[PDB]
Swiss-Prot record:
Keywords: Glycosyltransferase, Metal-binding, Potassium, Transferase
GN (gene name): pdp
Protein name: Pyrimidine-nucleoside phosphorylase
Gene Ontology biological-process entries: pyrimidine nucleobase metabolic process; pyrimidine nucleoside metabolic process
One Gene Ontology molecular-function label: deoxyuridine phosphorylase activity
């Protein structure tokens, strides 16, 4: 009857105690509390909300529901980035050597999984020889020595969040700030982060549609982090169009190398500097965000970020010479320009659908077992706001296949041309405290 009293307490607008929240999480996790009571509680939470203390308690109970990662043998303050991510987002690829070049320790755990493109592992494996088979001890020593390493992440983290999120998805209770914010924060805390940088996407197609909605979620997650002793900062950035030009795996390694040299697309340059600035301050490698940006800009210009990327590849078996000559990367058999049928200004690129078209070329997994061709993908040749003439290529498709008509039709259906267009501002808001 204890769960029923907990439901009624939340139903009545009361705060749940620390005891009650832990009882619920641990009993739901071990199967003693049934799905139907958890869904009832989640719906009562959807309506009644949770205080900051309840949100912190729920976050940490989910952290403590399964295995946790202890990174304390890695010297320094380990900052991790959570992004809901988006098409063309190379920030993780760029950020790891970029901030490591400032001695920010990057103890990166990632995987593969589904999506429109590969995971970080898939993208890094486009480099020949690169592999993630490290013991924890090797992983610790590589970060301590070179300040960057990647190991495959554990699959036994926050089992309570995996259960609860799946339940929320089939009961109409995803869209609750306390539930979203504790879900995201608990995964990063259980992974051993000392501090956390949030990239909260907003705009057309994103989960948070408005800057105001995204800011509300970011502030809730920042409050949780500070309440549980893991200092947290957020960037609210626009995802209405894909980031950069390259959409794929090897194509994004190639573009990331441009960004690491201080060149490459303007938007990813600005987002990487903005996110990296917060990481550098949180790790206590610069005193202000302006100073952190200056230091990041400088390791871009003097080539130390690129040098860090070479060391990182070399330490885990990859052919580092590909940084100096990215044509060594996997190339696709066919390169097909998709010419614009109309003249004007590119007014919309439906980012999620361009991602699907990339996947339909073989760039990501729709189902769990699918194979990824790391050479295929899409190069955007225009972004929102760019002028375009009839016949001028909108995108270039990189394919291992002769016929891509379905991919062509999807590109055309999801890129609009108007007489006038203005891209959204990329960086909407920063939450630094």
């Amino acid at each position: 009857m204890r769960m029923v009293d907990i439901i009624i307490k939340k139903q009545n607008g009361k705060e749940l105690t620390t005891e009650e929240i832990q009882f619920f999480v641990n009993g739901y996790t071990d199967g003693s509390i049934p799905d139907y009571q958890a869904s009832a509680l989640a719906m009562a939470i959807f309506f009644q909300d949770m205080s900051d203390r309840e949100r912190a308690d729920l976050t940490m109970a989910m952290v403590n529901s399964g295995e946790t990662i202890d990174l304390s043998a890695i010297e320094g303050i380990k900052v991790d980035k959570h992004s809901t991510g988006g098409v063309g987002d190379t920030t993780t690829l760029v950020l790891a050597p970029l901030v490591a070049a400032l001695d920010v320790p990057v103890a990166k755990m990632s995987g593969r999984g589904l999506g429109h493109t590969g995971g970080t592992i898939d993208k890094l494996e486009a480099i020949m020889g690169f592999h993630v088979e490290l013991t924890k001890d090797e992983f610790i020593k590589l970060v301590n020595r070179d300040k960057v390493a990647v190991i495959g992440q554990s699959g036994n983290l926050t089992p309570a969040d995996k259960k609860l999120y799946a339940l929320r998805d089939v009961t109409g209770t995803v869209n609750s700030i306390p539930l979203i914010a504790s879900s995201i924060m608990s995964k990063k805390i259980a992974a051993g982060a000392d501090a956390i940088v949030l990239d909260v996407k907003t705009g057309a197609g994103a989960f948070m549609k408005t800057e105001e909605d995204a800011a509300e979620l970011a502030k809730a997650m920042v409050r949780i982090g500070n309440n549980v002793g893991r200092q947290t900062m957020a960037v609210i950035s626009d995802m209405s169009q894909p980031l950069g030009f390259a959409i794929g795996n090897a194509l994004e390694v190639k573009e990331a190398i441009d960004t690491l040299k201080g060149e490459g697309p303007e938007d990813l340059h600005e987002l990487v500097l903005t996110l990296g600035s917060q990481m550098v301050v949180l790790a206590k490698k610069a005193d202000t965000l302006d100073e952190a940006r200056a230091k990041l800009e400088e390791v871009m210009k003097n080539g130390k970020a690129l040098e860090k990327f070479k060391d990182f590849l070399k330490n885990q078996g990859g052919d580092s010479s590909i940084v100096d000559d990215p044509s060594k990367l996997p190339q696709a058999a066919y390169q097909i320009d998709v010419p614009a049928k109309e003249a004007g200004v590119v007014s919309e690129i439906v980012a999620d659908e361009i991602g699907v078209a990339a996947m339909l070329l073989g760039a990501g997994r729709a189902t769990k077992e699918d194979e990824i061709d790391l050479a295929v993908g899409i190069m955007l040749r225009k972004k929102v706001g760019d002028k375009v003439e009839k016949g001028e290529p909108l995108v270039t498709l990189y394919a291992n296949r002769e016929n891509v008509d379905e991919v062509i039709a999807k590109v055309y259906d999801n890129i609009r041309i108007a007489a006038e267009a203005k891209a959204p501002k990329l960086i909407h808001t920063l939450i630094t405290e």
